[PDB]
Design a protein around this ligand. Structure first.
Ligand code: TB6
Ligand code: TB6
Ligand code: TB6
Ligand code: TB6
Ligand code: CO
Ligand code: CO
Ligand code: CO
Ligand code: CO
Lengths: 194, 193, 193, 194
């Protein structure tokens, strides 16, 4: 469902839910009731983020409650990604390169799923650059090499040496960092955020 | 703060998919500075359509990039005095069926829609069904006697409910109410949640 | 059907972690036939403790292995006539503070607990706070005038609420009610949800 | 929180939630109020599944609402599994071996997470044995070899050939099956249910 069509349906649902007619809602938004009826006819495409915020406010809810879900990009419940159509971004932490991300398949039907194959380019644990923690949990598996993992308080972190084949779970918001085991050059991880 | 929340959630999501300003800007046909501006709270004029494209490219929903409803409570409470409650007519098939008197609501629990409903007609035969609504509903007969109908409107389940009676109607179940035959009118407290 | 639902959910979970009867039975110190029996609905006599070990070994909760509350509705509706509603005394510090008259409830929405509360004392000075409860609460003043207090009981927020007034109290917010000073008593409809 | 201690706390919470005293609840369960008080003092360990079902029933809720969550087996938000402490079960479908599962790390803090390294032993797509679909979504990545995937209606399935490095998402409940590409012998997958 497109933005304006989904909005049109949800706006009407919410308005009816709080027992308001077009007139009542219009009176709260500096518009005519005809303009409100138009939005419910799919003509709200040009409403600004600020205006949507006001619409959600007077209707006592959130913009999210008035907009459609991400959508369906599946083929009868499945979506596949071939190896060479894999995205690749440079993870630089502290003005120096840390990670080379190879993006795996993603889907609007499960937006939190962000799987990646990460090449860890540094092998100096003291170079470990902590992130702030992720929304969502994360499963990891050491694909190649040896990983020196750190987590928790960046000033007094927990640490573990993970050989190839090892797997780990890191809870949402837990800060963590990764590097190849001291002097081992480089390692590879498959990281699955979910 | 719609723009402030968007600014924050946009940066978070962009970071979740390991994209930098240039990466995201490209997919959107924008410059990296424009994207930086959005994350600096300058996204207020983006249209619903543009928000849709931004969410699409980020593989998520507009909702995931916008903040929650907000907090309109006073230390966890919001009260509403009588006579300051909204009042709208409920017309079905050109007939003043119900009179909706809106009670307190809060952005901290958007699905809560409590109302005092004046049930105007007292002829069950002329009951008008709604097609059921999303969300559960709790009802209490405040005054008079209610004649309720639910389910298949062609062969509905029914109940005569005196004052003090209470009912629960599950989401999506069609229902209708009128006062008991010849009792003139009745009143319900209906709490959608 | 507690055992039937368990039978089904146990098999599902066991299958999710790719275990066969023998694998699971080993970890539990049982024979594979005993485990097959559970999945054949013969788990009724398992104790809370044993259920805890089974969930542990399956890396999940007892809840994930037991069915939902159940459906006690008649085509989506459940009604309750007055005078068949539960009634329990609310004693705080050895004082009959409230009189709880229970309205309709349903296993299809367990958190819904609607009540008509008789507020017995009319001296705000002697208000007794609860420490806040889980879940939101909607209230409506049915009769009389209510003197409500909330928040920090040592320096609370307060409101005088006439009949028809409505209120929303967020989960975990401490609160107390008495009738307005010298009005004898009052009545509230309180809907926990 | 242990079973009986968690139950003790939740039972009391629920009983108070529906404004019942020990006596009222006992009257509905063939027990004395003293017995009910004992349960709330952590002595409900011997209650049977059937008895718990009745307790949940009269309290108008589920057994789940009266028992603690799975628990916390994390080390400051993380749990690691070394390669050689990896479980291994034989996935046999139709009286013949299909898969050899190598279980990766799991956690009670996210019970739906079941990651595995699966060795696909057959390379005859016609041997493909469909499952019934999983509760929960599933991310997959072809670790080695080539996979012949099938999904949807087992009688008229969608199919795709996936080379090494390919990734896929299969929505919960969507039936699917896997084999090595015709005559390629065998392949390997990392499957992450979540
Ligand atoms: C491997 C990955 O978790 C590094 P980060 O994306 O969490 O910073
Ligand atoms: C009483 C109330 O439930 C009627 P409707 O608002 O759902 O149409
Ligand atoms: C009126 C009601 O909220 C009092 P309590 O049941 O929460 O203690
Ligand atoms: C690889 C894995 O998905 C096969 P199944 O466990 O779903 O049957
Ligand atoms: Co991470
Ligand atoms: Co209704
Ligand atoms: Co309360
Ligand atoms: Co699968």
């Amino acid at each position: 469902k497109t933005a304006s069509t989904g909005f049109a349906e949800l706006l009407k649902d919410r308005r009816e839910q709080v027992k308001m007619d077009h007139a009542a809602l219009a009176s709260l938004l500096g518009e005519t009731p005809e303009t409100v009826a138009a939005w419910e006819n799919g003509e709200g495409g040009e409403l600004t983020l600020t205006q949507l915020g006001r619409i959600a406010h007077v209707l006592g809810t959130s913009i999210g409650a008035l907009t459609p879900p991400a959508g369906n990009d599946l083929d009868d419940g499945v979506i596949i990604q071939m190896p060479d159509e894999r995205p690749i971004l440079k993870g630089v932490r502290d003005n120096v390169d840390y990670y080379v991300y190879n993006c795996l398949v993603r889907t609007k039907r499960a937006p939190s799923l962000v799987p990646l194959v990460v090449d860890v380019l540094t092998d100096n644990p003291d170079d470990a650059k902590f992130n702030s923690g992720h929304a969502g949990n994360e499963f990891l598996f050491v694909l190649e090499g040896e990983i020196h993992m750190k987590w928790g308080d960046k000033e007094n972190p927990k640490e573990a040496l993970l050989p190839t084949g090892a797997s780990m779970f890191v809870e949402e918001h837990v800060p963590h960092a990764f590097t190849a085991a001291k002097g081992t050059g480089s390692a590879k991880l498959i990281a699955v955020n979910f």
